[PDB]
Design an enzyme around this catalytic site. Structure first.
Site, short mmCIF file in Angstrom:
data_model
loop_
_atom_site.label_atom_id
_atom_site.label_comp_id
_atom_site.label_asym_id
_atom_site.label_seq_id
_atom_site.Cartn_x
_atom_site.Cartn_y
_atom_site.Cartn_z
CD1 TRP A 83 -1.61 -2.29 2.02
CD2 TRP A 83 -2.92 -1.46 0.40
NE1 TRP A 83 -2.58 -3.22 1.75
CE2 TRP A 83 -3.40 -2.74 0.76
CE3 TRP A 83 -3.58 -0.75 -0.61
CZ2 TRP A 83 -4.52 -3.31 0.15
CZ3 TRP A 83 -4.69 -1.32 -1.21
CH2 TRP A 83 -5.15 -2.59 -0.82
CD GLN B 163 -21.73 3.08 -13.03
OE1 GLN B 163 -21.80 1.98 -12.52
NE2 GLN B 163 -22.50 3.45 -14.04
CG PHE B 164 -26.70 6.59 -13.95
CD1 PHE B 164 -27.89 5.89 -14.19
CD2 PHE B 164 -25.55 6.20 -14.66
CE1 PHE B 164 -27.94 4.81 -15.11
CE2 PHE B 164 -25.59 5.13 -15.57
CZ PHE B 164 -26.78 4.43 -15.80
CB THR B 165 -26.30 2.93 -10.77
OG1 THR B 165 -24.93 2.57 -11.00
CG2 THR B 165 -27.03 2.98 -12.08
N1 LIG Z 1 -9.40 -6.83 8.00
C1 LIG Z 1 -8.35 -7.24 7.25
N2 LIG Z 1 -8.45 -8.31 6.43
C2 LIG Z 1 -7.41 -8.73 5.68
N3 LIG Z 1 -6.21 -8.13 5.68
C3 LIG Z 1 -5.97 -7.04 6.46
C4 LIG Z 1 -7.06 -6.53 7.31
N4 LIG Z 1 -6.58 -5.48 7.97
C5 LIG Z 1 -5.29 -5.32 7.58
N5 LIG Z 1 -4.92 -6.25 6.68
C6 LIG Z 1 -3.57 -6.37 6.06
O1 LIG Z 1 -2.61 -5.70 6.89
C7 LIG Z 1 -2.01 -4.59 6.22
C8 LIG Z 1 -2.49 -3.24 6.78
O2 LIG Z 1 -3.03 -3.35 8.11
P1 LIG Z 1 -2.28 -4.06 9.36
O3 LIG Z 1 -0.81 -4.22 9.06
O4 LIG Z 1 -3.08 -5.28 9.73
O5 LIG Z 1 -2.43 -2.97 10.55
P2 LIG Z 1 -1.61 -1.58 10.55
O6 LIG Z 1 -1.88 -0.86 9.24
O7 LIG Z 1 -1.88 -0.86 11.85
O8 LIG Z 1 -0.07 -2.06 10.59
C9 LIG Z 1 -2.32 -4.76 4.75
O9 LIG Z 1 -1.17 -5.31 4.10
C10 LIG Z 1 -3.48 -5.73 4.68
O10 LIG Z 1 -3.21 -6.73 3.68
#
Ligand SMILES: Nc1ncnc2c1ncn2[C@@H]1O[C@H](COP(=O)(O)OP(=O)(O)O)[C@@H](O)[C@H]1O
Lengths: 151, 152
Positions: A63, A79-81
């Site tokens: 991310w 996207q009206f919908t």
């Molecule tokens: N509810 C969830 N379901 C699946 N994966 C999650 C979820 N929450 C976080 N993640 C995974 O963890 C990462 C971001 O959140 P996380 O590391 O769990 O907590 P934080 O962002 O506090 O370190 C992402 O890589 C995501 O893939």
């Protein structure tokens, strides 16, 4: 305003047998519902977020990279919908979506802005208010929802 | 819960170069996100709306028939990213999403209820918590967004 953002390996837009009119490879596709009450500020937020959200992992970190960093493209579809509602009734209703004349004005302002903040080559569009058929290659998949009335 | 419905002519689901595991023709893709504090009421509602929303045109009339009326399939995909929090910063936060183990078990209780209220062979799933590749032939497109928290 509302946006469903989908991360994709590619998307192929078509119109009526159909012929292709738009095409993107890697990048985002953004379903854009314009609300009756959308000031230009509602639009601004949607744009920045669309362009600057960090949805691609990076030979290391999850991310992290946005669409701009990786030089990817965007496909913004009307996207009206997206306000197709909730109250008892399996028919939708889009009388919460901006009046489809003032909306077309708005939408096209938005695409100027997308281009003016990114790069005009990278903003591929749709035929506003027409029937379209879009092959999407969801990647993940990853689906971001955003609503500007929450602020 | 929050759900993102797309009306589709077709959908091919791949996992790990890739492998196909799930395929629907006309129907819906539902990108389903499960809140930390979701209830079984919430889940019911979502099921009722996928199943009952009238999105297909029919003869003289628009928004007439639902997925069931037409014997169309449904592909149900878990989507924790729907609870990405993008208010602060540009790195989304998935804190309000249910956690994988607890959400998997719910999801499955949601699926089986789809097969309950409808029929087995019209309900397709992905692989929970795995990278998936999903080619979606988008019909319209038509994209619906319900979030049950806006209700009672
Ligand atoms: N509810 C969830 N379901 C699946 N994966 C999650 C979820 N929450 C976080 N993640 C995974 O963890 C990462 C971001 O959140 P996380 O590391 O769990 O907590 P934080 O962002 O506090 O370190 C992402 O890589 C995501 O893939």
């Amino acid at each position: 305003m509302r946006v469903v953002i989908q991360r994709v390996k590619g998307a192929i837009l078509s119109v009526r047998e159909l012929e292709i009119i738009s095409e993107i490879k890697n990048g985002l596709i953004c379903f854009l519902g314009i609300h009756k009450n959308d000031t230009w500020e509602d639009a601004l937020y949607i744009i920045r977020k669309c362009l600057n959200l960090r949805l691609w992992n990076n030979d290391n970190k999850t991310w992290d990279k946005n669409v701009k960093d990786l030089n990817y493209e965007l496909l913004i579809v009307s996207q009206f919908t997206l306000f197709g509602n909730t109250k008892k009734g399996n028919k939708p209703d889009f009388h919460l979506a901006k009046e489809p004349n003032e909306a077309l004005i708005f939408y096209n302002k938005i695409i100027d802005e997308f281009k003016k903040q990114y790069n005009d080559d990278k903003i591929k569009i749709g035929k506003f208010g027409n029937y379209m058929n879009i092959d999407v290659t969801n990647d993940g998949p990853v689906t971001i929802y955003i609503d500007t009335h929450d602020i």
